[PDB]
Amino acid sequence: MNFPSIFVPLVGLVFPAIAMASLFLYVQKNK
Amino acid sequence: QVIQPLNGDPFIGGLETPVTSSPLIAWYLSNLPAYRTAVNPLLRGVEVGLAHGFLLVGPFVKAGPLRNTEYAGAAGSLAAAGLVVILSMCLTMYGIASFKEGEPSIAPALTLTGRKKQPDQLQSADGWAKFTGGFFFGGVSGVTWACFLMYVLDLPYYFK
Amino acid sequence: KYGDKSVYFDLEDIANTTGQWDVYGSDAPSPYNSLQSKFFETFAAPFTKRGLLLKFLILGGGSLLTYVSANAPQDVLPITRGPQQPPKLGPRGKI
Amino acid sequence: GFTPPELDPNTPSPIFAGSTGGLLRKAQVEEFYVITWESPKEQIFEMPTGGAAIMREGPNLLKLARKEQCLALGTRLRSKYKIKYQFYRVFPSGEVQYLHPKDGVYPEKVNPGRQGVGLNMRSIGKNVSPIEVKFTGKQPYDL
Amino acid sequence: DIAGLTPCKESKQFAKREKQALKKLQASLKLYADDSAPALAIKATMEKTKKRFDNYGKYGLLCGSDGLPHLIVSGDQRHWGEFITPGILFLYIAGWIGWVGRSYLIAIRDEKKPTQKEIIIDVPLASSLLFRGFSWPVAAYRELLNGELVDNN
Amino acid sequence: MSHSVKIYDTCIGCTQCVRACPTDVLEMIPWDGCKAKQIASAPRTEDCVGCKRCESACPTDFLSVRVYLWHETTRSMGLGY
Amino acid sequence: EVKILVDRDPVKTSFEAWAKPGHFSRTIAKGPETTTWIWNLHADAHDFDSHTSDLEEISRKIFSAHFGQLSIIFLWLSGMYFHGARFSNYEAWLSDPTHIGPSAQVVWPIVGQEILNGDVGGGFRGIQITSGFFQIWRASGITSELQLYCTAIGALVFAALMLFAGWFHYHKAAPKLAWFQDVESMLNHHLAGLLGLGSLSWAGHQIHVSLPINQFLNAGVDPKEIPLPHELILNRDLLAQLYPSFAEGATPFFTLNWSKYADFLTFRGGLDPVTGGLWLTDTAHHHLAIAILFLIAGHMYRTNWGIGHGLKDILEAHKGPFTGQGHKGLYEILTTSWHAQLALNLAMLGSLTIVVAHHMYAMPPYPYLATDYGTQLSLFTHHMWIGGFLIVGAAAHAAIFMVRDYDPTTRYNDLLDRVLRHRDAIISHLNWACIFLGFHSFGLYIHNDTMSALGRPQDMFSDTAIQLQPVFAQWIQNTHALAPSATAPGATASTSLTWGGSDLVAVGGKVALLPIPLGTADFLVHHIHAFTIHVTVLILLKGVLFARSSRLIPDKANLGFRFPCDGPGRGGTCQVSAWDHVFLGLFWMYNSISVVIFHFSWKMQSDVWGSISDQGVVTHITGGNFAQSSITINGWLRDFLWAQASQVIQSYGSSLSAYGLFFLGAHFVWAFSLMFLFSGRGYWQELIESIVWAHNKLKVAPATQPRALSIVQGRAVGVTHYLLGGIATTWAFFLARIIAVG
C-alpha cells in the first residue's frame, strides 16, 4: 500500500485547511 | 460639473463620477444577483455559483499540468470543482465569523433618496448560509455544465 | 431636517448623516421563474445548514482528495510511476 | 457654572466639492466628531481631509472622523483666522458629548474648578522598581 | 628557522616569485622601443622589484612555503624590527598626537565659549603645544604619578 | 484601555505640554508647588494617541509629563476607518 | 515693462561671513553646543528658502549658484580637454581607432600603482577611459593636441568669466524680482538664442569644419596631412572639391533652391559603414532644421511689443467640465515658487537623459562609437543613473512645494485641489497596479525557476514553451523597418539598424549594430521594468500627495517637510514625512535602473555585440544565451552575474585591478550602509555616553558634546552609502567585464 499518496495530501492540504479554519473561527469569536 | 459629491455630501469618503453613478452602471449593478435584496439569497447564490464555476473551468483545463494530455478535460475540471469546494468553505467560515443566530440583518435600511427600505437578508446568518449553499450547488453545476459542453457533448469551440 | 439646503447633520436621522445607504441594492421582485426558484430551493436545501455544510465540505474534500491521489493511474503523475531508468553513480563512487 | 452649548443640527456646512478623505464606516458603527464655529467673513480655508473649502458667513458645522482632525482644524482657525470653535462627539445612538473646552476655557490657561487626574506627588526617578510590583496588577507609575 | 620557515635569502620559491614578476614585466616591456618613456618606466619598475627582493632577502625575513615573507611578532630578538620597533615608533607617535590633543583640550577648557575654539582652531596655541608631545612619555608618567592624568569626577 | 499619562511634581507650570497636545488630553489646573501656581493634568487619556509631543516640549531635567504606551483602541491607534 | 531691473551693490564683499560658520540662519549662527550643529551646518547651507522669506534674495542666490555650477562645469571640461591634450594617445588613436584603446589618464609611479598604466596601444601606457571624448573630438574635426590645449585654455577663461559673473550679479549688480519673473522673455531667449542659435552655430561648425575633416579622415588621408579647418574656410574651392554645391555660394539658399545643397545636407539615415556612426551630413541637416524650428518657436510669447502669446491667458483658456476652472492660477504658482519649477525641470531633464541614453545606444552619432563597447555601456549606464536621480529629485522638490509654498488662500489652483481631493483613489489604484504588475511579472520568473527546477521545461514561459511574444513591439519594429518604402520615401535607409532587415554594420571585425530580436525574455524584462517604475511612482506620488495631511496625521504640514516621525503613537508614525518617501523611493529607483542596465548589458552582449569573421559569420560575446537563460532568476545569477564577474574577480595583478578593488570596496560600503539603515539613534547615543565617560575620566572630553546622528540624518547616511556601494559595484563590474573582453 502506498502510504505517502494518502498522508502527504492529508498533512499538506486537508490538515492545514482544518487547522486554519478552526483557528479562524476561534480567533474571530466574541464570547 | 460632472464629478459630484457622494449623494450631495462632500464630507463622506467618496465621490460621484460617471464610473460610479451612471444610470447604465447603476442599472447593471442593481440587476446583479448580489444587489437583489428582495429575492431569496439561495437563488442569487445559485446564479453567482453557476457563473463563477462556469468561468473557473477554462483556466484550469487550459493551463493545468495535464493540459497537453488526454486527461486535460477531466482533471482540470475536477480542480475547478475543488476550488469551489474551497471557496464555499471560505464563505461558510465568513458566515460563522460575521453573523450570529440571534441578530437581525445588518444591511442598510435606506436608499440614496433616503426612503425606508427593507434590509437585505444576505447580511444575516440564515441568509448567508443559504447564499453559500446556493453558491456551492451552482459552482458544481457550472463546472459539470462546462465539462459537458466542452468534452462530453463535444460542441465546437476555439479553446483559446 | 437633513434634506434642507447646505445642512447634512441630523440628530434624529443618523443613517443619512453617516451615509448608511444601499447604493446599488434594488427592491425589485424576483426575475427568475417560479418553477426555477422552486427547483433550486428544494434541490439546495441540504446545503443550507452552515455548520453541517462546513463539516460535509471538509469530509468530502478530504475523502475525495485521498481517493483520487491513492487511486490515480500510474501514467498520469510522474511521481506515481518510478524512475524507469537505471540509477547513476555519485561523484566519488556512490559515497 | 459653565453650561455646554447645545449642538444645532440645522447649522449650515462649509461649501465643499467633495473629497475621498471624509467619513467612512467608522462614522456609522462608531462615533464621529462635529466641529462648529462662527466665521465673521466668507473666506476659504484648508480642510484636514485634503483640499480646500469655503466657509460661509455665520455659523459653520463640519463633520469629521477623528478628534485629532477636529483639533487641528480648530487650532488652524484660532491661529490664522481667530475664530472660536467647539467640537462634539456623536454616537450612532444620537448621543452628543461636548468635548473640547470642558469648562468653557481653553486647557492651556489655568481655570479654577479642574480636578487633578494622573497626578503623582514625587519626582520621576522615585518610581517603584518592577520587582516590587510583580504578580500584582498595579504598575509602578500607577502607584 | 622559526616555525619551520626558511629565510627569504635562502628560499627557492622567493627567487621563483621574483622570476615570475620579472618575466611578466619583460613581457610588458617587449611592446615598446627601449628609448621611449613607457620602456623607461617599466625598466625602473623592474629595478625597484629587484631592489625590493634583495632587501627582503637581506633583512632577515623568514619566507614560508609559498615564497612570501612571514612576520614573527612573538618577540624574538632576530625579528624585533618587524613588529616591536615599528610598534614602539607608532606608540610614540600616537602618544604624541593624543597628548597634544589632550593639552589643547585642557588649555581651551576654561574659556567663555570653548566650542568656538574647536570648530575654529586657535593656531598659535596649537603650534605652541605641538612640540610638547616630544616628551610625552615623561609628562604622562609624571602626571600619572601626581594623579593629574585621571579625573575622579 | 488607554495610554497612561502621568504628571509629576517637578512640573514648572509652563503650558507647552498642553499646547503641544493634538487630542486635548492635558489641561492646566491650579497648584501651589511652583512659581506659576499651576500644574498639568490628564483627565482625557482615553483620547491619547501616544504621539509624545507633550513630553517633547517639557523643559525639566527629565520629563514631568510621562506617556506610557498601553492597551490600544480605535482612537488610540489613530484609525479614521 | 520687461526691462533690466538691477540694484547696485546689495551685498558687501568681505570675509567677515567666512569667519563665522552658519551665518545664513539664526538658530545656527549662535555657535555649536553639540556636534549635531556641524551636520546642520551642511544641511541648511543651500536651503535659501529657510534662510530668508524674501523671494528676491533667494532668486539672486540661485542665479549666482547657477553661475558657480557653470564655472565648475567649465573647469571640468577644461580638465578633460587638457588631459586629452597631454597624458593621452588621441593622435595615436586617430590613426587606428579599431585597435587602440582610448586613454587620457596616467598614474604616477608610487607604491606600485603604476601597474594601472595598461598597454592600451599606440605606444602609450595609461588608464583606459570610457567617457567617449575621443569620438566627440573626432566628430568635431580635432586632429591635433594643440586644438585640445586651446579648447582647455578657452574653457578655463570661460570658467573664470562664469565665476566673475556670479560674483558680479550678486555682490555688484543684482537683478530684481521682476527680472526673474519675466518668464516670457526668458523662454523666448532660451528657445531662440540659446537652443536655436546654438544649434545653428553647431550646424555651421559641422558644415564648415567637421564634414571636410571627417571626409578626409574616412578617405584614409593621414591626420597630420589633412588641411587645417581654417584652410577650408579661406579656400572655398577646397571645400567645393568635396561638396560641389559650395561653388554656388549662399544663392541657392536665398533663391529657395535648397535641393542644390543635397550633397552635404542629406536625409540618409542608418549608419556610416566606414565609421559605424551616424552620417555627419545627417547631423548637420538635423541641427539646421532644429535651429530653424527653435528660432521660429522662440517668437511665441509676448513682450514689450503687443504681438505674441501670454502664458497666463493660454493657461486660463484651457478648462474642461471635469476639471472645473482648469489651469487658472498655475502661472502665479509657477512664477512665485522655485521648488515647483525645480520639480518640473528635474522630471523633464531626467526623462530627457533617459531618452538620450536610449537614442545614443540605438543611434551612435560619433565615429567608432558603436564598436567601442565600453563607451556605449558606460554612457548608457551613466545617463540612466543621472535620469533616475533627477526624476527622484523632481518628486523630492514637489513635496517641498506642497509643504512650504502651497496655500489655497492665495495662489489657488483648481486642478491641484481636485488632485488632492481624490488622492486616495489615485494611490489605491496605483497600489493595485503595482501588485498586479509585480505578480504577473515576477511570479512568472518564479514559475519558470520552479518548472526548470522540477524538470518541467515545457511548462515554463519560454520561446520553446508557453510563449509571451511582444506582438506590439515587433509590429512597431517591422513598421519602422519599412519606413523608407512608404511612410518616409525621402529617407534612403531606416532611422536605425535595431528594427530589422538584412542590414548589418561592422567596423574592424566588431559588430556595431544588429536587428535586435524581441521575444518572451524581452517581454518579461520589460514588464518587470514597468512594475519597478510604477512602484517608484507610487512611493513618490504618495509622498507628494500626503506631504500635507492624511487620515493619520491631519497636521503633517505643520511638522515640516523633513521630520523623523510623530512619536510611537497611533501604533507608530515612523517615516511619515515626504522626505522619508523620497528616501524609500531612492532604493526603488536604484533597483529599477539596476535591472534596466543589467538587461541592456546582457542583451547587447548576447544579441548585438560580438565579432565578425572573414567568411561572414557573427559570434557574440555570450553566445546568445539571453533567450533561454534570462527567463529565470537562476539564469541571471549564473550566466550573467557569476559568469561575467570572472573578469572583475580575476583582474588582480593586471591593469584592471583597480576595478577589483572598487568591487570589494563597493561591497564593503553597501554592507556598511545597513548599519545606519537597520539601527536607531538611542542605542548609539547610549554607547556614546559610555565613551564620553571614558574620555571624561582622563580629562579629554570635548566641549562640543558628542551626539549620535539624528534619525533623518541616519536614514540619509544609510541611503547615501547604500546607493554609492550598489552603484560602484555595478560600475566596477561593468567596466572590468567590458574592457577585458570588449
Ligand code: CLA
Ligand atoms: C503570478 C503569476 C503566475 C502566473 C500567471 C502563473 C501561471 C501558470 N502557472 Mg505558475 N507559479 C507561480 C506564478 C504564476 N504562475 C508561482 C509564484 C508559483 C510558486 C513557485 C508557481 C508554480 C506553479 C505550479 C506548481 C504550477 C503552475 C502552473 C501554472 C498554470 C496555472 C494552473 C492553474 O491551476 O491556475 C489557473 C487558475 C485560475 C483560476 C486563473 C485565474 C485568473 C482569472 C482568469 C483572471 C482574469 C481576470 C479578469 C479579466 C478580471 C476582470 C473581470 C471582468 C468581469 C471585469 C499557469 C500556466 C501549473 C502548470 O505547471 O502548468 C504550466 C502548475 O502545476 N505554477
Ligand code: CLA
Ligand atoms: C502540500 C500539499 C500540496 C499538494 C498535495 C499539492 C498537490 C498538487 N499540486 Mg500543488 N501547490 C501547493 C501544495 C500542494 N500541492 C502549494 C503550497 C502551492 C502554492 C505555491 C501549490 C501550487 C499549485 C499549482 C499552481 C498547481 C498545483 C497543482 C498540483 C497537482 C499536481 C498535478 C496533478 O495532480 O494534477 C491533477 C489535478 C487534479 C485532479 C486536482 C484534484 C483535486 C481534487 C479532485 C479536488 C477536490 C478536493 C480538493 C483537494 C479541495 C478540498 C479539500 C479541503 C480544502 C476541504 C496536485 C493536486 C496543479 C493543479 O492542481 O491544477 C490542476 C497546479 O496547476 N499546485
Ligand code: CLA
Ligand atoms: C539669448 C541670450 C540668452 C542666453 C544665451 C541665455 C542662456 C543661459 N541662461 Mg538665460 N536669460 C536670458 C537670456 C539668455 N539666456 C534673459 C533675457 C533672461 C531674463 C528674462 C534670462 C534668465 C536666466 C536665468 C534667471 C538663468 C538663466 C540661465 C542661463 C543658462 C542656462 C543654460 C545652460 O547653462 O546651458 C549652457 C549654456 C552655455 C554655456 C552656452 C553659452 C552661453 C553664454 C556663455 C552666455 C552669454 C549669454 C548672456 C545672456 C549674454 C551676455 C551678457 C553680457 C552683459 C555679457 C544659460 C547660460 C540660468 C543660469 O545658469 O544662470 C547662470 C539661470 O539661473 N537665464
Ligand code: CLA
Ligand atoms: C507641463 C508642461 C511644462 C513642461 C513640460 C515644462 C518643461 C520645461 N520647462 Mg517650464 N514652464 C511651464 C510649463 C512647463 N514647463 C509654464 C506654464 C511656465 C510659465 C511660468 C514655464 C516656465 C519656464 C521657463 C521660463 C523656462 C522653462 C524651462 C523648461 C525646461 C527646463 C530646462 C531644464 O531642464 O534645465 C536645463 C537648463 C536650462 C536651459 C534652464 C535654466 C534654468 C531656468 C532658466 C530657471 C527656471 C526659472 C523660472 C523662471 C523660475 C523663477 C521664479 C520666479 C517667479 C521668482 C523644461 C523642459 C526652461 C527652458 O525654456 O529651457 C529651454 C526655461 O527657461 N519653463
Ligand code: CLA
Ligand atoms: C538639480 C539641482 C538640484 C538643486 C539645485 C536642488 C536644490 C536643493 N535641494 Mg534637491 N534634489 C535633487 C536635485 C537638486 N536639488 C536631486 C537629484 C535629488 C534626489 C537625490 C534631490 C533631493 C533632495 C532632498 C532629499 C532634499 C533636497 C533639498 C534641497 C535644498 C537644500 C540642499 C542642501 O542643503 O544640500 C547641501 C549639500 C549637501 C548635504 C551634500 C551632501 C552630500 C551628497 C549627498 C553626496 C553625493 C556623493 C558623492 C557623489 C560621492 C563622493 C564621495 C565623497 C568622499 C566626496 C535645495 C533647495 C533638501 C531640503 O530642501 O530640505 C528641506 C532635502 O531635504 N533635495
Ligand code: CLA
Ligand atoms: C526582495 C524582496 C522584496 C519583496 C518580494 C518585496 C515585496 C513587495 N514590496 Mg517591498 N521592499 C523591499 C524588498 C522587497 N519587497 C526593500 C528592500 C525595500 C526598501 C526600500 C522595500 C520597500 C517597499 C516599498 C516602499 C514598497 C514596497 C512594495 C512592495 C509590494 C509590491 C509588489 C507586489 O505587490 O507584487 C506582488 C508581490 C510580490 C512580487 C512578492 C512575491 C510574491 C511571489 C510573486 C509569489 C508568492 C507565491 C504565492 C503568494 C504563494 C504563497 C505560498 C503559501 C505557502 C503562503 C510587495 C509586497 C510597494 C507596495 O506597497 O506597493 C503595493 C511599495 O510601495 N516595498
Ligand code: SF4
Ligand atoms: S508637565 Fe511639562 S509642560 Fe506641563 S507644566 Fe510640567 S514641565 Fe511644564
Ligand code: SF4
Ligand atoms: S522609533 Fe524613532 S522614528 Fe520610530 S516613532 Fe520612535 S523615535 Fe520616531
